[PDB]
Enzyme design. Structure first.
Site, PDB file in Angstrom:
ATOM      1  CB  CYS A 102      -4.335   2.189  -1.821  1.00 58.33           C
ATOM      2  SG  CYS A 102      -2.903   1.112  -1.854  1.00 58.33           S
ATOM      3  CG  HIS A 120      -5.472  -1.948  -3.157  1.00 56.53           C
ATOM      4  ND1 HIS A 120      -4.460  -2.098  -2.205  1.00 56.53           N
ATOM      5  CD2 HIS A 120      -5.381  -3.004  -4.014  1.00 56.53           C
ATOM      6  CE1 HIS A 120      -3.786  -3.228  -2.508  1.00 56.53           C
ATOM      7  NE2 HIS A 120      -4.340  -3.779  -3.598  1.00 56.53           N
ATOM      8  CG  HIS A 139      -1.687  -1.226   1.511  1.00 59.63           C
ATOM      9  ND1 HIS A 139      -2.826  -1.665   0.824  1.00 59.63           N
ATOM     10  CD2 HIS A 139      -1.430  -2.135   2.493  1.00 59.63           C
ATOM     11  CE1 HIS A 139      -3.212  -2.822   1.401  1.00 59.63           C
ATOM     12  NE2 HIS A 139      -2.378  -3.102   2.408  1.00 59.63           N
ATOM     13  CG  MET A 180      -7.905   0.116   0.852  1.00 55.27           C
ATOM     14  SD  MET A 180      -6.089   0.030   0.822  1.00 55.27           S
ATOM     15  CE  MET A 180      -5.727  -0.035   2.596  1.00 55.27           C
TER      16      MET A 180
HETATM   17 CU   LIG Z   1      -3.859  -0.659  -0.770  1.00 51.42          CU
END
Ligand SMILES: [Cu+2]
Length: 98
Positions: free
Chosen positions: A83, A86, A39, A91
């Site tokens: 992120c 993501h 991340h 997220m």
């Molecule tokens: Cu992530």
């Protein structure tokens, strides 16, 4: 006294928790790396200014289960972090500097 977020549940689901934090102008906030890496914590300039959003961002790739980041919440305002990978997978997390 900094707030502490984790990039994923300390189990195995990618959620930013706490997903919304409220802390004071001039304090800092830490993030903890967990699981489902990589991340990063990339702030979009989500109402707030480009330069501040940039300096508060972390494009550092977090591989080590131990690496943690800190951001300085000087300017009162909204910072919205996600992120990179993501980003649109649901997220995301939000910051309200008071
Ligand atoms: Cu992530």
């Amino acid at each position: 006294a900094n707030a502490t977020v984790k990039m994923g549940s300390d189990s195995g689901a990618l959620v930013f928790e706490p997903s919304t934090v409220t802390i004071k102008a001039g304090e800092e906030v830490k993030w903890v790396n967990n699981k489902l890496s990589p991340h990063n914590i990339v702030f979009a300039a989500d109402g707030v200014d480009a330069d501040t959003a940039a300096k508060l961002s972390h494009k550092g790739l977090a591989f080590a289960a131990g690496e943690s980041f800190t951001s300085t919440f000087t300017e009162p305002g909204t910072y919205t972090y996600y992120c990179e990978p993501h980003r649109g997978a649901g997220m995301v997390g939000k910051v309200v500097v008071d």
